[PDB]
Amino acid sequence: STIFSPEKALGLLLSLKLSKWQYITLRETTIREGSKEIYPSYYKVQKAKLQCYPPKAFVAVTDSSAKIALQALLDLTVNRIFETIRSPDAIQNKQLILISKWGFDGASNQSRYKQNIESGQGDSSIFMTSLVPLKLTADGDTVWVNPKPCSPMYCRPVQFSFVKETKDVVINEKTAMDDEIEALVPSKCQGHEISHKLMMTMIDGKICTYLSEAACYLCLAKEFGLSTLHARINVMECLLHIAYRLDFKKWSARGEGHQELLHSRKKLIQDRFKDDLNLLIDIVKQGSGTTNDGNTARRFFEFPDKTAAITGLDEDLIRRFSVILQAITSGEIIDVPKFKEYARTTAEKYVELYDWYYMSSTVHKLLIHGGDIIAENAIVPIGSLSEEASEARNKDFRRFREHHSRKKSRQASNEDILNMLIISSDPLISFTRPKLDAHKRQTYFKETVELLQLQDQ
Amino acid sequence: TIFSPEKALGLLLSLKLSKWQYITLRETTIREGSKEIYPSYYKVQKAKLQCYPPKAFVAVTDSSAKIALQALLDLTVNRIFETIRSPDAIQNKQLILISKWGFDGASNQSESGQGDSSIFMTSLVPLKLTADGDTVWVNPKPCSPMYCRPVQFSFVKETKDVVINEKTAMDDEIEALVPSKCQGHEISHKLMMTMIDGKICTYLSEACYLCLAKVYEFGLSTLHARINVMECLLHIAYRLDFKKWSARGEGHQELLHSRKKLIQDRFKDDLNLLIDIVKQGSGTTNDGNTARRFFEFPDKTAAITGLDEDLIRRFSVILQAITSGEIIDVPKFKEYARTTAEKYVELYDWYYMSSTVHKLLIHGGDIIAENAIVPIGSLSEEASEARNKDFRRFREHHSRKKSRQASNEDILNMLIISSDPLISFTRPKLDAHKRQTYFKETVELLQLQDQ
Numbered sequence A: 001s002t003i004f005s006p007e008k009a010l011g012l013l014l015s016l017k018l019s020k021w022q023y024i025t026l027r028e029t030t031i032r033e034g035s036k037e038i039y040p041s042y043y044k045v046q047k048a049k050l051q052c053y054p055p056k057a058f059v060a061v062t063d064s065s066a067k068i069a070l071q072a073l074l075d076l077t078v079n080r081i082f083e084t085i086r087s088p089d090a091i092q093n094k095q096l097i098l099i100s101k102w103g104f105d106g107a108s109n110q111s112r113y114k115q116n117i118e119s120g121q122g123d124s125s126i127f128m129t130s131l132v133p134l135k136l137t138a139d140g141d142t143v144w145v146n147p148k149p150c151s152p153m154y155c156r157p158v159q160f161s162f163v164k165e166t167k168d169v170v171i172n173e174k175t176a177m178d179d180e181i182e183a184l185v186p187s188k189c190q191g192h193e194i195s196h197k198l199m200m201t202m203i204d205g206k207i208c209t210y211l212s213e214a215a216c217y218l219c220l221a222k223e224f225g226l227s228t229l230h231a232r233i234n235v236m237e238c239l240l241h242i243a244y245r246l247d248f249k250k251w252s253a254r255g256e257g258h259q260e261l262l263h264s265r266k267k268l269i270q271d272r273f274k275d276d277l278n279l280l281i282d283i284v285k286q287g288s289g290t291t292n293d294g295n296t297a298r299r300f301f302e303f304p305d306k307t308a309a310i311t312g313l314d315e316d317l318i319r320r321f322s323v324i325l326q327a328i329t330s331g332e333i334i335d336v337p338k339f340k341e342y343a344r345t346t347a348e349k350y351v352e353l354y355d356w357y358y359m360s361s362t363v364h365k366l367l368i369h370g371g372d373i374i375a376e377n378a379i380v381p382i383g384s385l386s387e388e389a390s391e392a393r394n395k396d397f398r399r400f401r402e403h404h405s406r407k408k409s410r411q412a413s414n415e416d417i418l419n420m421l422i423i424s425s426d427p428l429i430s431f432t433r434p435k436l437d438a439h440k441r442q443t444y445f446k447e448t449v450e451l452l453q454l455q456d457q
Numbered sequence B: 001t002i003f004s005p006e007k008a009l010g011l012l013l014s015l016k017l018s019k020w021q022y023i024t025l026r027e028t029t030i031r032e033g034s035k036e037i038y039p040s041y042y043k044v045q046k047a048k049l050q051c052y053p054p055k056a057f058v059a060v061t062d063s064s065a066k067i068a069l070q071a072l073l074d075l076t077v078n079r080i081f082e083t084i085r086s087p088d089a090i091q092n093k094q095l096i097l098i099s100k101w102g103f104d105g106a107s108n109q110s111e112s113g114q115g116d117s118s119i120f121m122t123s124l125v126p127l128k129l130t131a132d133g134d135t136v137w138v139n140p141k142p143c144s145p146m147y148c149r150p151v152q153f154s155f156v157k158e159t160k161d162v163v164i165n166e167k168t169a170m171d172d173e174i175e176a177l178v179p180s181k182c183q184g185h186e187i188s189h190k191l192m193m194t195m196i197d198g199k200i201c202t203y204l205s206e207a208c209y210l211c212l213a214k215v216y217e218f219g220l221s222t223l224h225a226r227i228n229v230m231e232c233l234l235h236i237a238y239r240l241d242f243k244k245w246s247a248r249g250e251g252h253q254e255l256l257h258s259r260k261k262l263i264q265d266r267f268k269d270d271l272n273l274l275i276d277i278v279k280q281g282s283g284t285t286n287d288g289n290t291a292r293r294f295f296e297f298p299d300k301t302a303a304i305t306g307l308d309e310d311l312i313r314r315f316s317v318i319l320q321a322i323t324s325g326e327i328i329d330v331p332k333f334k335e336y337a338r339t340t341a342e343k344y345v346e347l348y349d350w351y352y353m354s355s356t357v358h359k360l361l362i363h364g365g366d367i368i369a370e371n372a373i374v375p376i377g378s379l380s381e382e383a384s385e386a387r388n389k390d391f392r393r394f395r396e397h398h399s400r401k402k403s404r405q406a407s408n409e410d411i412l413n414m415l416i417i418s419s420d421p422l423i424s425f426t427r428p429k430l431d432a433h434k435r436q437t438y439f440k441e442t443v444e445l446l447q448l449q450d451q
C-alpha cells in the first residue's frame, strides 16, 4: 500500500540523516502535490524503531557508560535475522548454530580546540565493545549468512563507556564479557533453538599482548586485525613524515642539519593546514605525540588535490591511498581481485616517488596484504564506528543541553546514541538500507565505487 | 514530474535539505519503483539561477552586499508576472506596482569567527499590481519574509549616520526609476518607506485617543516584539518578591538583585541561556535568538522565572503568529490579545505594562489587519546567524579572505530565493522548523489547522 515500508522508510531516514520533522514535512509536502504511495506515517516509522530496541530492563545508561546484557542482544538479533530469511521454514529446530564475532576498540576526539574553556561535558574519549553475527548453520549448511561481515551495519553495540583505553580496562572488559559468555548461551525463536559460538577476533596487536602478559614468511608470491581507524591515521602520519623530509629526502633526520629543516618544513605544512583547511594536523596535546583523531585523518584525505599542494606530496599517491581507505571503511563488498591490482600499483607508485622512506608496518600490511585481509573478512570497524559515535554524542549534547541540565542532557545523549547504534546495526533495517549514504555518495571518488562494484548510483 | 523544479526548490528550502540529501532522496525513491516524484538537481539549480539578477550589481565585498533596485524591481516584476493566472491584462499602457521598503538592524553575540556580526539590512516588499485601478496581482503574504526582497545589507552597527546614509542612498535610486518592462506591459513603480520604526523617524527629522481599537504608532517589528516582551516579563519576575513596580525601596534593590541572579542562574543550568549578559557598556545585549528560546518552552520558563505559565504561552503563541509572516485570523487574534491582556492585569496589575506590550495586546489586531508588521530585523538576524554557519563550513575548506565573501555571496542569494515571487507561490505554508515549534493555539490563529 506504500512504496516505502515503515522499516524501509527508517532506512531512508538514516541514509539521509533526516529529522523527524523533516520527514513529516517531506511527507505532507509530497502529499499536497498529489502522491501518497511514497512515504509511511512517522507513527509507523517510530514503531519500526521501537522494534529494534531490546527490552528496557536490560539497558543501563549512566552519565558515564552504556551497557546491554549480552543475552538480550543476541536474542534480539536472532529474531530480526529470521525476519530477513526468504522462507524461515528450516528443518533443524533442535539446534541452530549462530556464529558471531566480537571485540573492542577505542577512539579519541577533539571539539575544535578549547583548553581551560570547556564547550560542554564529556571526556572526548570513547571505549566500545561490539558484536557481529556471521553464519547461521543447520546441520552443517548455511541457512542465512551476513552479506557484509565487516560493515558497521551489522556491528551490534554491547557496552561503550567514555573512558580512555587502559591496559586495565581491556582486561576488565575481557573478563566482564567472558563471564557473561561462559555462563549463559541459549536462545529461542520461531520454533528453532539457536546456540551461540562467539569468537574474539575484532582485536588489534596491542590488545593481544595485554591478554597474554607478553612475520612475513619472507612474503611469498609464487597480518592481524586491521582497524579502519588505525589504517586511516597511520597512513596520514606516514605521508606527513615523508612531507617533512622532502628537503633532504632521507628516512633518518639524524644527519647534519636535516633535523634543522625538517622542523622548518613541518611548521610550514602545519600552518598551511590551519589557514587553508582549519586543520590541526600534527598538533600534540602531550599524549605521547600525535593527537590526531580519525576526524583529522578523514579530512586529510577528503581532498587529495589540495592535500598535495599543502604537503608537497604527489596527488596520484594521495588519491590512491584515500580511495583505498574509503573502500575499507565503507563496509561494503570489495572486488578483491580488482582491489589487489589497485593496491599492487599504489605500492609501485610509492617506491617510484619515495623509495627512501621505508613503508610503515601499517602501510605495508595495507598495500601488500590488504587484498587477502579483505578476502578473509578480517577488517575491524569498531574503531572508526566508535569515533563516529563520539562525534555524534557531542553533537547530541550540544542539542539537548539547550533544554536540559548537564547531568540529564549527558544521559539523554547516551540513551539516544545507544538507540542510533542499534537501528544502524539492526539486521532487518540494514537489510534494506542503501549501499551508500548520502554522505558516502558525496565523498566517495570515482575509483572508490569502481572498487565496490556498486550499482547504487 | 510531480514536483516542478521551483516546487522542489521550495521543498528544498522548507526542509533545509542539502544538495546531496536531495540527490540521494531522489535516487532512493526511484530504486523503490517510483520516478515521477523529484526532478534533477541541475534543474533545481537552474531555477535558483533564475531568481538572481544579472552581473548588474552583484556587489558582495568582504563587508557588504548591495543590489540596484532597478535590476531588482525589474527582476521582481518579471517574477510576479509568472504567477498570474491569465496574463491577458488588456490595459497595459501604464501599470502601477506599489511596493514597500524600509530598513532595520540587528545585533549578535556568541571571537573565533570573522565579521563585525552586527547587520543592517534594507529590504523591499511588493504589494499591488494595478491596471487602470484594478487588482491584477496582490501579495498573499504582505508581511512574510517570503516576499521580503533584499536590497542591501552591510555588517555595520545601526548608526545614526548609516540610517540617513541609507535614506538618501535609497531616495536617489528612487527618482532614477524607469518603468519596468514585461510581457508587453509597462510597469511604473511607486515606493513608500513604511518599514520604519519611531527611532528612524526622529533621525529623519533631526498618542492614544484614550485607547481605541475596533501606521498605528508606526507598526511593529517582529524582532523588537519578542525582545521587549521577554524583558517586560523578566522585570516582572525580578520584582515578584515584593510585588511593586518601583525597584527603589527598603532593601528591595538588595533582593531584586538577588532574584535577578537566581533567575539568571536558573536559565544557565536549566537552559544554557545568557539572559541579561553584558559585553559592552553596562547594557542588556539580549539577542533575538535569546528571545526565541525564552518563549520556546513556556512550561519551563515559568518554573524558572516564577511567572504564570498560561501568560507565558499566551505571549509566545502571539509572537509566533506575528513572526510567521503568514495571514492571521484578525478577529481571532484580537480576541486572543484582548484576553491575554485581561490575564496580565489578573496576575500583575501592579506592574504597568510596557508600551510594546500595550501596543501588541491592545492595538496589535489592527496593526496585523493593516499589514503594518515589519520583518526586517528578524530576517536580518536569521541571515546573520546563517552566515556564521556558512563561514564555519566554508572555512573548513577555504581561506578566510575568500570565505568572508563566499558567505556574503551565498546569504544574499538565499535572501533572494526566499523572497522570489514564483518560489514563494508554491512554498509549503509553514517550515519544517515551524511544524516542530508552533503551538496548537498558534496554528489556529493562522488557520493552518489541517496542514
Ligand code: NA
Residues within 6 Å of the ligand: B431, B433, B434
Ligand atoms: Na524558520
Ligand SMILES: [Zn+2]
Residues within 6 Å of the ligand: A216, A219, A364, A368, A369
Ligand atoms: Zn608482508
Ligand SMILES: [Zn+2]
Residues within 6 Å of the ligand: B208, B210, B211, B212, B358, B362, B363
Ligand atoms: Zn492604546
